């Protein structure tokens, strides 16, 4: 699993066209204030342990930034070893569930299987932008 | 070299703290209207051929999107096989130079070696967000 952690002053997205024949989540849109935005690419090897490591690391990083909102943003583009879409959807649901057991703030998982427009204002401090890899 | 192509309605950045002992570019800030924003991670193997392939592909993609502004945005976080900073700076300068021989619009290379805040509004059409790899 490859993640990009972006500490935003604000974030919003809107689903536009379907990217999958039948997206498993409904269309919609949402906007946020200060949040850790986690662009998340699920990789072929990802299983339960990978999800638990990532949930721990996101919670720990959120804690040190003192953010109380996490956005789990499905992203196809961080890796060249993608899981298939149905496995990726399942892992992202698991990740959202695991993160709730480790992090006490707002957890928002964005819809899977859509093209989306988005806007972000990302902070420019030294820890505002980091990448992570998790495996089992 | 790993790139992320983001077709933006608007983009702006500001350098904040130095990320390198002595950044090779001066601090500053800039904002743009519609642009292809190219987040660019230079990798250990990158040489002249890699720069020429990437310059061709960015020009060709810009052409099909009908954009007339390209932002070359140095980014540490797209890969786990980074070139050293002085080689990466040199390759990004080469890339800017090569892209000018292939693409007739505004080319803006952002300063290397800074932490930066940024804002982007990214379009949500099917080709608004793509990743690329180039090697030799
Ligand atoms: C494209 C851009 O506008 C938007 N942000 C998008 O990337 N959409 C992706 C994810 O929502 C999802 N998806 C499919 N496979 C995966 C995977 N392995 N990991 C994560 N997400 C996946 O399915 C869409 C098809 O690429
Ligand atoms: C960090 C974030 O706010 C900002 N956007 C940033 O990423 N800054 C990077 C690039 O400007 C540059 N840099 C160093 N090595 C490389 C490399 N191999 N490829 C590209 N850039 C590099 O040096 C800084 C140190 O990571
Ligand atoms: Mg809508
Ligand atoms: Mg300034």
Experimental method: X-ray
Residue entry with tokens 């992090």 = A103
Q: Which domains are present in chain B?
A: 1-134 (3.50.80.10)
Question: Maximum CA pair distance of chain A?
Answer: 40
Q: Token digits for B112?
A: 């290397």
Beta strands B35-41 and B69-74, pairing class? parallel
CA distance B9 to chain A (A): 10
Q: Which residues of A touch B124 (CB under 8 A)?
A: 14-17, 115-118
Q: Token digits for A101?
A: 């057991």
> Nearest 5°: CA angle at A119, between A1 and B68?
105
> Which of B133, B129, B132 shows the shortest CA–CA distance to B6?
B129
> Which of B43, B13, B39 shows the shortest CA–CA distance to B134?
B43
Type and span of the H or E element at A86: helix A85-100
State the closest ligand 2 atom to the C-alpha of B76, by its place in the atom list counted from 1: 7
A17 alpha carbon to ligand 3 midpoint, in Å?
Answer: 10
Residues paired with residue B18 on neighbouring β-strands, in sequence order: B114
CA separation for the pair B55, B2 (Å, rounded): 13
Resolution (A): 1.9
Q: Token digits for A34?
A: 């200060």
Residue B60 phi/psi, 5-degree rounding, is -65, -45
Query: What DSSP state is assigned to residue A110?
Result: P
Residues paired with residue A71 on neighbouring β-strands, in sequence order: A37, A108
CA distance B133 to chain A (A): 9
- Name B134's Cβ contacts closer than 8 Å, sequence gap at least 6: B1, B3, B46, B50, B53, B54, B57
Please give the distance of CA B87 from its chain centroid, rounded to a whole number: 15
Taking the CA atoms of chain A, what radius of gyration do you get in angstroms? 14
Residues paired with residue B8 on neighbouring β-strands, in sequence order: B35, B122
Query: What DSSP state is assigned to residue B100?
Result: H
Residue A102 phi/psi, 5-degree rounding, is -120, -15
**Residue A80: other Cβ atoms inside 10 A:** 11
> Which of B56, B70, B69 shows the shortest CA–CA distance to B132?
B56
What is residue A115's three-state secondary structure? strand
CA separation for the pair B39, A49 (Å, rounded): 30
Length of chain A equals: 136
CA separation for the pair B70, B53 (Å, rounded): 16
Closest CB to A17 among B17, B117, B126: B126
CB contact under 8 A, B125 and A17: yes
Alpha helices in chain B (DSSP H): 48-65, 85-100
Q: Token digits for B86?
A: 């002085």
């Amino acid at each position: 699993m490859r993640l990009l952690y972006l500490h935003a002053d604000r974030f919003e997205y809107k689903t536009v066209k379907p990217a999958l024949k039948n997206p498993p989540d409904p269309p919609g849109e949402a906007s946020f204030g200060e949040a850790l935005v986690v662009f998340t690419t699920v990789e072929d090897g990802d299983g339960p342990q990978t999800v638990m490591y990532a949930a721990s690391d996101i919670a720990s990083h959120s804690s040190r930034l003192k953010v109380t909102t996490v956005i789990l943003y499905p992203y196809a583009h961080l890796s060249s070893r993608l899981a298939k879409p149905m496995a990726a959807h399942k892992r992202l649901i698991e990740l959202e569930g695991a993160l709730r057991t480790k992090f006490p703030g707002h957890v928002h998982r964005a819809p899977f299987g859509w093209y989306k427009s988005f806007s972000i204002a990302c902070k420019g401090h030294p820890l505002a932008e980091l990448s992570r890899s998790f495996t089992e």
